[model samples]
Target chain A: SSVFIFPPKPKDVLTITLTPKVTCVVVDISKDDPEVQFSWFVDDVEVHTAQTQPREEQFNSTFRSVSELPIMHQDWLNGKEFKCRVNSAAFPAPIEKTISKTKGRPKAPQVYTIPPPKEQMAKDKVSLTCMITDFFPEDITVEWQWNGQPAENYKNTQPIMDTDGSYFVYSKLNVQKSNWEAGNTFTCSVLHEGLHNHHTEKSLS
Target chain B: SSVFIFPPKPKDVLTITLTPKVTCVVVDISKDDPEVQFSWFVDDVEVHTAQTQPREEQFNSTFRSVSELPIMHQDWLNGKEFKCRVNSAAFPAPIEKTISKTKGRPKAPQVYTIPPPKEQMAKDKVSLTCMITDFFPEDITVEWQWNGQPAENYKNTQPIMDTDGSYFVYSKLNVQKSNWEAGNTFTCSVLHEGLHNHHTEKSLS
Candidate 1:
């Protein structure tokens, strides 16, 4: 009776890519989507046709699209806050994300959780990698927890630099398969000077 | 005594490049141009911040820029006519070019002139080639002239088709070295049913 519209989850709504000449905004949607659409705006006035075609990417559990829009002027962001509104006709209510660029502003790192390969999990030990990116002032800490308590077997890598001066680090958690298959929750949390929240976490069960 | 601003010639102001999704409009100005700028519009509604970076290319006697703008939606052209306004500060009043797209409209060809290599001209015969492109309905005729008199030693090629159903043809004129070095003017003219004027020409001495 009603058209189905699978909106992007709030946590993964959008991300921004910037260059001196252009700013590219990105969003993820169901690749199964028959038609994809995105609208950009400055305050309330829509930037009519700045969206690029959606690109297909890997996320084996569920196919998703990496949709992007090119923002050509730095002034658009400096002049006012920008918005990215996304939707899909192939299978989609829109999810809108707001962003802005300010000189000397603090940057926050985003968190991602990656699981061990299914085949690899059959072995005695399982490893989960936590990828954190884009925060500035490189000194950052990563911690792991298992079943609501601190976990011991984990290693953190050195922070690496990106072109934009932000930093990224990988934290890997290794645990016995016995604990993994028991439906225990494992969490990765990052602490950085730039994030107003101080900490960002991702959990896998 | 005054600041300099060179304007693009009317004939080469802009050209349109289109795909199902993006429309790229181009313009050529002096490559020596230090700071180039372009403005686009849908009638009087200026498309602020649509211009792209300028690229430098060949034009021996003078430097010129081949600048372009990307137009994204087919509906915009259907919505109204588009304009590309160009200017340069490196060595530039703006020259404005207009464009539109219709399902069944005729396409007109643009003309270019290519002279023989300067050193080669001292050897034997000097040649001048006229390049005509983007016209549809391939029946095009090419003519040549020495001063004001008909030129006999010339050849026209068959029209070749482009991806968009338009056509391009070349006409070559070979004149004796004696006449070429004498500073006599030579011209190449194209007659196509698509052009309202029925003809277009280029002259070089």
Candidate 2:
């Protein structure tokens, strides 16, 4: 069947609340076809769907089903998998949506610049490194610009994961030392799937 | 059979090349067992696997299959789907990975704040709106803090997607007019799934 499923949001991680509560995960499955059914699974074991209802009833009537699992906190801590499968007679295969618990928001990155040696400051090329550390969800971007135009000759290392699951990445830019003394500005913009438009600018004077 | 797959990265979207170059998508399926085979598909049509090789030969020897799909840019622009299916005698079903082209990196967001009305500046409670506009990938967060501590009574609207696929969000905070004039500092932090810590601070003299 022709079914569409919205992907999970970036912050769709398990939020730890202080109150002792059951592990609840909610998923919504919407289909244009009215004749559809849903099935859920946790760690590959069939689990009953908790909530189901029609979401819209217009020309493009949308049939929606919501599934919630009241799981034990222990299972969540142990990294259990959750899946929502939608099946319709019109489809050859089932559409499945799967997710597992992930760490929360990333901590703010500490942005700074490591200056070139004083003796070579105004003669040789200098490199600027945008060091991002202690972040979760390794999806991040590092962009460079020099003097208001897109800068070239820059590279970023693959994000390295720490033992705690946090990550760090380094993006470096090489620039002419003469431009540094000429008051040219360079900006290092950091983009993470978690943060929006984080930037740090530096120039040698 | 237990199979683990690494999810796609944020920058995993299709890169359109104007040079009429071949659009190649690569995926590696690594398993503990070495006796697995792969099947490839494009738009549901079976395609022969390309570039198959064993990955490693260590203690936990991982058998990896690397698959690459090369297609014309026109086909990619027409929204062709690429799928990698893995099958093994030890498993009941095949594992699959699918991907499609998406827009590239987002431009940095323009962050600014709107001050409360001058008439109500120092006499009534004032509300400040932190506006972030022109971002990609609808995942973002708006955080607020006052005088270095997390602020209260602040709310952000759901990210509004724009016609161009960019997103915008607004966060507002209310504070006592007395506090506004008392030199209290307030910061509005914007976190995008693609960024780290992005904030703009405004203070009343």
Candidate 3:
């Protein structure tokens, strides 16, 4: 028995309804050999195959990854690559195709919100903590400012890394005196990677 | 100045890059039309347009939403949808292609770990707390058992929902008993949504 392998290939959409109710990925893997059997792989695991006609053969997996008929949201973007390899138990090995996505660094936003201070105080010491979650371009810098002036007394909390490789950053600013009585506004801003201008101060009180 | 207006047409994916970069949707407007400025809109809001080009032609503008990539752990895995529309003041408007994507969900051994209980006791006035970190099924059950028997006087903790909408269910069992024991195993097992049975015995402590 010969075993064939298919490298991870990018799956394309054939026909999309209004929104994208169902997504189907079709791989035509007859080029390896006419008589040999073909095994399909998604991500890395093997998938079942089907034959439409004697001369024509195709392998597909239908999944409901997207709902809604016409309008598509920004949620369902999967650059998941699929691959297939041909196998002949007696052959040396299965031949496969390797076509990977060449996109640049991923774009992911991280947002952190600190709960409002427990008790309002005037001329009291306070610490404002800002957390940054789900951000890409690891070189992001987060800063805190009060009334558009850099707060002198603040601490930068270390970030905790998630399992999926995304990062989380936390920064704590220490205020020796509270001007909550003066309607002091606190803002947190970030200078993201690949961006020339600083895109911080998004955190609003 | 003679200006022309065109009806919105169905969208198509004229160009797509699977490279691993932060993806930005670029819309190309007909650059051949003179005195006509190409304008782009996202979700119906006019974002950016070009006024420098006077010759009627095709020009493209890219808009970045900053940080909106949905995490992989969303409960139901329907992908995100994005619509690209283009129009000009001197000519009719044409809507571009609609692209939808489904992010990949992690398929690990599906390991769920709970921290060691603060207190584990048997027989006289003991309290045990079971904590589960992450799971994708909509609903799960937390059952506690002692020495292979059903737990007595168990208080179910409220399930905490994650940002991606998955859940973590916990339970705290407190029993004031006279049947004191030297050595007994406390167990917490989870029964998932679709499985008729469960992969039981998460922890035996």
Candidate 4:
């Protein structure tokens, strides 16, 4: 007599998405079709894909965009041992999700440039910090736009999903420097259903 | 005691895609855990589903959208006893997908609407056709984007699979209405990777 049924531990949830420097990784599977196989090694060799799937979009850091864009630039992001594999027979064999910073980044948080629009003087009491980096289903919502108008003097402080979940949303408009120089396009938009939409603009100096 | 392997059939390629201009009818089940139980009827009068699994991405429609944004403007699309019943103690006893157009839409050869803009001169040979009536796995890729650019020409066509196998892809765009009015959103796009890159643009004016 033998009875046992317990097999559901791959606990997958590796979502890494960035567009500034180009990097993408999504390994979300629950019911299992786990025939996955991906590798992007850097400091250890092996980084050449004739194409099966990888480099899903944009970032010509220069692979010359591999004949009109397959995107995954800089010779596999400068090499750094980025891995992803599943099933040697059934799981575990390649999993590092890399980044030594020389290239192929993916440890999260690396938005590059955004957040430096300093200008304020309305009633002369400004405080704005629209921050954003990576994003995902972390129930996001940050709105505040002026000049494109829609800022009732906003305030948001709930987006913080990072343990590799991705995302760091912050919005605190509170204008005054004469309405932040007549609200120079000042904006921060994020309405997440699952996060992917983002809009950041600034003009305050 | 009778046994039939396959006899009762009527629900052929009964699709209902509406993101524009509205028109409705739907019954799709590629095994969504369906033993049976969708029991719907329009002309036959059963019609009324408050709960089944259609929150709308476009599953039901008759038309009237855009400010109402979609408040469930489903009031039937005039039919021929559309039926649906999935009651399965194990399987068998409900299935229907009709509409010989008993009273509407079904004449064939009319999915062509291209007219506007004239300043012809030079080779002047224009033709437009984008009549993707139904759907399925049909290796679709019909490109030609000018004015909006990227669609430089076209002439591929080969997809027809109706009989329940589902699929009907049509794409043919030949230009020169002065390069389609100096190009401005002349499109004909559709690339099917399991229905995930949907496109069917039409404009040559």
What lDDT does the true structure give each of the candidates? 0.57, 0.55, 0.41, 0.38
Q: What is the C-alpha DockQ of each candidate?
A: 0.01, 0.01, 0.02, 0.02
Write candidate 2's Cα lDDT for B47-119 as tens digits.
Answer: 7644455444434443344445555443443456666677766657877766554456745566677778676
RMSD of each: 22.6, 26.7, 26.3, 21.2
What are the per-residue Cα lDDT tens digits for candidate 4 across A66-138? 1011223222333333332223223444344443222222322222223335543323576767675675534
Q: In candidate 3, which residue ranges exceed 4 Å CA deviation?
A: A1-104, A115-123, A194-198, A203-205, B1-205
The native-contact fraction of candidate 1 is 0.00
Per-residue accuracy of model 3 over A147-171 as CA lDDT, tens digit each? 5556767666555567876667888
Residue B86's lDDT within candidate 4 is 36
**Model 1 segments beyond 4 Å from truth?**
A1-104, B1-205
Evaluate model 4: give its TM-score: 0.22
Best by DockQ: 4
lDDT score, candidate 2, position A72: 41
Poorest stretch of ten by lDDT in candidate 1 chain B:
B9-18
Model 4, position A140, has a per-residue lDDT of 40
Q: Report the C-alpha lDDT of model 1 over A1-205, residue by residue, as the tens digit.
A: 1122222211111111112122333334344555555666767788765545446464554334433444433243234566667665643476666655433555777778888877897799889889999976555667787854677899989889898888799999998777775768787866553542234456776
- Order of candidates by lDDT, top first? 1, 2, 3, 4
In angstroms, give how far residue B186 of model 3 lies from its true place: 52
Which residue ranges in model 2 land beyond 4 Å of their true spot?
A1-120, A136-139, A146-149, A161-166, A178-185, A193-205, B1-110, B113-205
